[PDB]
Design a protein around this ligand. Structure first.
Ligand SMILES: [Cl-]
Ligand SMILES: [Cl-]
Ligand SMILES: [Cl-]
Ligand SMILES: [Cl-]
Ligand SMILES: [Cl-]
Ligand SMILES: [Cl-]
Ligand SMILES: [Fe+3]
Ligand SMILES: [Fe+3]
Ligand SMILES: [Fe+3]
Ligand SMILES: [Fe+3]
Ligand SMILES: [Fe+3]
Ligand SMILES: [Fe+3]
Ligand SMILES: [Fe+3]
Ligand SMILES: [Fe+3]
Ligand SMILES: [Fe+3]
Ligand SMILES: [Fe+3]
Ligand SMILES: [Fe+3]
Ligand SMILES: [Fe+3]
Ligand SMILES: [Fe+3]
Ligand SMILES: [Fe+3]
Ligand SMILES: [Fe+3]
Ligand SMILES: [Fe+3]
Ligand SMILES: [Fe+3]
Ligand SMILES: [Fe+3]
Ligand SMILES: [Fe+3]
Ligand SMILES: [Fe+3]
Ligand SMILES: [Fe+3]
Ligand SMILES: [Fe+3]
Ligand SMILES: [Fe+3]
Ligand SMILES: [Fe+3]
Ligand SMILES: [Fe+3]
Ligand SMILES: [Fe+3]
Ligand SMILES: [Fe+3]
Ligand SMILES: [Fe+3]
Ligand SMILES: [Fe+3]
Ligand SMILES: [Fe+3]
Ligand SMILES: [Fe+3]
Ligand SMILES: [Fe+3]
Ligand SMILES: [Fe+3]
Ligand SMILES: [Fe+3]
Ligand SMILES: [Fe+3]
Ligand SMILES: [Fe+3]
Ligand SMILES: [Fe+3]
Ligand SMILES: [Fe+3]
Ligand SMILES: [Fe+3]
Ligand SMILES: [Fe+3]
Ligand SMILES: [Fe+3]
Ligand SMILES: [Fe+3]
Ligand SMILES: [Fe+3]
Ligand SMILES: [Fe+3]
Ligand SMILES: [Fe+3]
Ligand SMILES: [Fe+3]
Ligand SMILES: [Fe+3]
Ligand SMILES: [Fe+3]
Ligand SMILES: [Fe+3]
Ligand SMILES: [Fe+3]
Ligand SMILES: [Fe+3]
Ligand SMILES: [Fe+3]
Ligand SMILES: [Fe+3]
Ligand SMILES: [Fe+3]
Ligand SMILES: [Fe+3]
Ligand SMILES: [Fe+3]
Ligand SMILES: [Fe+3]
Ligand SMILES: [Fe+3]
Ligand SMILES: [Fe+3]
Ligand SMILES: [Fe+3]
Ligand SMILES: [Fe+3]
Ligand SMILES: [Fe+3]
Ligand SMILES: [Fe+3]
Ligand SMILES: [Fe+3]
Ligand SMILES: [Fe+3]
Ligand SMILES: [Fe+3]
Ligand SMILES: [Fe+3]
Ligand SMILES: [Fe+3]
Ligand SMILES: [Fe+3]
Ligand SMILES: [Fe+3]
Ligand SMILES: [Fe+3]
Ligand SMILES: [Fe+3]
Ligand SMILES: [Mg+2]
Ligand SMILES: [Mg+2]
Ligand SMILES: [Mg+2]
Ligand SMILES: [Mg+2]
Ligand SMILES: [Mg+2]
Ligand SMILES: [Mg+2]
Ligand SMILES: [Mg+2]
Ligand SMILES: [Mg+2]
Ligand SMILES: [Mg+2]
Ligand SMILES: [Mg+2]
Ligand SMILES: [Mg+2]
Ligand SMILES: [Mg+2]
Lengths: 173, 173, 173, 173, 173, 173
């Protein structure tokens, strides 16, 4: 009884992979934001996102697998072979990748219902919520690049974003 | 003047890669220690080592590159396609990989002197020291598997290792 | 036994001289940043660098000489006969001088090894590390002049730099 | 209206120069007091005087110039090519130089009145007062060398002088 | 891989021996300073140096050997068969022995570089720094015997030296 | 009057020698307990005993000699040329040496009475008491090796022994 779903196991190993590789890309993007684009606060913002992906995002999957019999796979390949040409396109690329996260997570929730895997539907709610939360945080930074042409002004607003004391929204937080 | 050394830049990008990939392997090994071998404290020990490799070990290199003109490369490929057969061989494999870290770091220090790159010789001292420190921490766990045949006894000693309040040795710490 | 190296003694007297004269130039540059360029926070930043050069940078050499038999020489000549034409070129000139510090310090470390003077190699590590740290702090200010065209915006970021509570990096700090 | 006095501007640039060069001589004398004469507390006393000359003594002039249109000049040349033969003559030479400070400052106050430069007469009162205060502190050390022939006894009294908690005299302080 | 250097192992066993034997000589010299020369504070100063040599100086070597495979040897022979004739020559003999420590340590650092043993070069930096620090502390006491002919005056200065609250120099401390 | 006993002076110089040499042997045994036998807590236990022998055990004799005219001799020769084959025999050898301490101390007390040296009989009571106390502490560790065959179980009991807050027995403490 309660035999783990091979399809969910695959979908969650792929999401594990995605969060690792994304995290490594973001670590590179954070370096470049500071080093090439002269926006260390943008770099800190993107670095925080990198450690989020390589931290709880992947840890919760590993933890879940230990509880239910699913098998963990580590299979990672990512190379950063070109970077966006400026800081605005850098954060817009981060926005694009987060939007894809929401789409991947949606498929997993849909599959959990199809499989009548209610523990997995429950588990993925965290990622359903976090998909929109992370996108909103990235969206808040994208907006700055359309509200001013001064990189130091933008940097000052990002600084208060990343130094703000963590305050989670009642629903999305 | 003060043109960065291309050879050191390469050696440090390779060490960056090594710490990322090692960190990902250790994350898998930590999962398996708990999940397959029933040693969650061994898992916590190995997980702490994974976050060390994927944290300060790689961050200090990125930070160094920003200061001196060296270029960061992200090029990562690692797959965990077989695991050691039991917990003792698991930690012994971690020991083997840490011993190789010391050997890689030694080459970088030797090269920094060859290149008369004294900022890089200075920078790598942290990794010279940490090479032996991490090996010693791993060695302390390996020892347990030769001092008792009872996994719960071993687990209890590992627990106090990982829950001990961080105390750095005057030289190696 | 343990007869001090005349070559190191000369190289360190020359570095003592350099830090005195640099410190006096920076004191002038700080005056001009405020007085001519209307950037008092840039002035405070450069003044802090002046007191650093005329403080610990020279004091540690004098202290070192007392311990090992090296002779101190005071021979100082510096006149500020032209200034850069604007604040951006002012900080860029400070950047140029700090880059030369790294080059002078590198030669001293190389010479200490050549002389098998390991106390002097040890002593100069502080200056190896500080060469890059000071350059990085200056680099952070140079960057501002390329990220905004508004002197008050630049001044506000410099203000938080110089008023920030001193936080030393684990390696470079 | 309120056009700065070129004569005062010159006299104060010369006093700026004097305080820089004196400060550098005192730094050397402090080194020698400890290193050659075995009187580290005398060295600390003279070092404190060096940092006074290179600190507020020169900073107040730079600050004054920013407020009134006077131009700062940095033109510094000083070499310590012989030292007094013992500690008593060392402090007596410091006494001689401080006595000359009083004479230079007197001329500036006299000139400010001649120029009807009452802001400059006001400004120089600090230096009028400090001329006698510094001379008195130096005088207190000179006295010790005539009250005992034992360098350690002298050193113990100097120690309590320099370690005393700063207490400014109502008039001279 | 990472096979320990037999030459460094020998040099460090010899330094272990030196610190043990020195420590035992200093324990005797401390006894004599008090008992024969009536200078208990000089005795406390020399006793503190004895416990330093027999404490961390030797402990760090033993600790190092445990981490890297080097073998510890205990082979100790020392007899105090004559003592200096007075307190001044007593501390001057301590000065002579500390000067030899610096020379022994220099050889070990030179050998570590020759052996491309960068963990051992790192390890010995503590002894490079401490070689000069201990010599400076001894030098400070030697100086007293040339600054006064009164043993109680000398004793009072030594008392404040040994009772001073430990304050480490940024570089040498 | 009150002329010191040459026989007691000899017996106490020999006991001084014994405590030095024992202390050095124990320092080696502590290294080996950790390094070869994988029992770092046994190592800490034996290291504490080493510092006891090289600390108060010898210091009280030196102090005693200063008060009464006895002469201190430093004449030390000890080499550790073979070690016991396992941890149990290691602590059993420590037990054997402590048992001999009791026998040496007994002879000194007997001699003090024979010499009508009541200050020396008084002085040696500390060593009479400590002879049994140290033997009892060693005995408590020996016992563990007969109560379990698991080195980690033994190590856990030793850990609480050495980390216990010092509590002296009303008589033996
Ligand atoms: Cl199903
Ligand atoms: Cl090069
Ligand atoms: Cl030489
Ligand atoms: Cl006028
Ligand atoms: Cl080799
Ligand atoms: Cl008798
Ligand atoms: Fe840059
Ligand atoms: Fe930065
Ligand atoms: Fe977050
Ligand atoms: Fe978790
Ligand atoms: Fe699994
Ligand atoms: Fe590729
Ligand atoms: Fe790419
Ligand atoms: Fe940009
Ligand atoms: Fe664009
Ligand atoms: Fe589906
Ligand atoms: Fe997230
Ligand atoms: Fe299970
Ligand atoms: Fe668990
Ligand atoms: Fe750690
Ligand atoms: Fe960093
Ligand atoms: Fe780069
Ligand atoms: Fe593969
Ligand atoms: Fe594999
Ligand atoms: Fe197992
Ligand atoms: Fe096995
Ligand atoms: Fe090389
Ligand atoms: Fe590490
Ligand atoms: Fe237990
Ligand atoms: Fe327990
Ligand atoms: Fe103005
Ligand atoms: Fe101002
Ligand atoms: Fe600073
Ligand atoms: Fe200093
Ligand atoms: Fe000198
Ligand atoms: Fe000129
Ligand atoms: Fe110029
Ligand atoms: Fe400007
Ligand atoms: Fe311009
Ligand atoms: Fe050279
Ligand atoms: Fe600096
Ligand atoms: Fe603002
Ligand atoms: Fe603001
Ligand atoms: Fe000297
Ligand atoms: Fe000193
Ligand atoms: Fe003052
Ligand atoms: Fe001011
Ligand atoms: Fe001006
Ligand atoms: Fe000249
Ligand atoms: Fe001169
Ligand atoms: Fe003198
Ligand atoms: Fe004289
Ligand atoms: Fe006049
Ligand atoms: Fe003054
Ligand atoms: Fe006496
Ligand atoms: Fe006494
Ligand atoms: Fe000390
Ligand atoms: Fe240690
Ligand atoms: Fe060993
Ligand atoms: Fe002999
Ligand atoms: Fe001798
Ligand atoms: Fe004497
Ligand atoms: Fe004499
Ligand atoms: Fe060599
Ligand atoms: Fe020391
Ligand atoms: Fe006194
Ligand atoms: Fe006194
Ligand atoms: Fe081992
Ligand atoms: Fe250990
Ligand atoms: Fe004890
Ligand atoms: Fe005592
Ligand atoms: Fe005696
Ligand atoms: Fe022998
Ligand atoms: Fe033996
Ligand atoms: Fe054993
Ligand atoms: Fe046995
Ligand atoms: Fe008898
Ligand atoms: Fe005892
Ligand atoms: Mg399948
Ligand atoms: Mg259905
Ligand atoms: Mg290349
Ligand atoms: Mg070379
Ligand atoms: Mg010369
Ligand atoms: Mg050579
Ligand atoms: Mg003019
Ligand atoms: Mg008039
Ligand atoms: Mg050999
Ligand atoms: Mg070579
Ligand atoms: Mg006799
Ligand atoms: Mg009788």
């Amino acid at each position: 009884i309660m035999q783990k779903s091979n399809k969910i196991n695959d979908a969650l190993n792929q999401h594990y992979k995605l969060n690792v590789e994304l995290g490594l890309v973001y670590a590179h993007y954070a370096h470049v934001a500071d080093d090439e684009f002269d926006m260390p606060y943008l770099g800190k913002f993107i670095q925080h996102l990198s450690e989020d992906k390589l931290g709880v995002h992947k840890e919760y999957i590993s933890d879940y697998f230990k509880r239910n019999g699913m098998k963990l796979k580590t299979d990672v390949s990512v190379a950063v072979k070109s970077i966006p040409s400026d800081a605005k396109a850098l954060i817009q690329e981060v926005y694009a990748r987060e939007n894809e996260v929401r789409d991947h997570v949606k498929a997993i929730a849909k599959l959990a219902l199809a499989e009548d895997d209610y523990e997995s539907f429950y588990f993925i709610q965290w990622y359903v919520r976090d998909g929109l939360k992370d996108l909103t945080e990235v969206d808040d930074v994208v907006k700055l690049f359309n509200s001013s042409n001064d990189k130091l002004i933008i940097e000052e607003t990002i600084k208060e974003m990343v130094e703000k004391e963590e305050s989670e929204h009642e629903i999305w937080g």
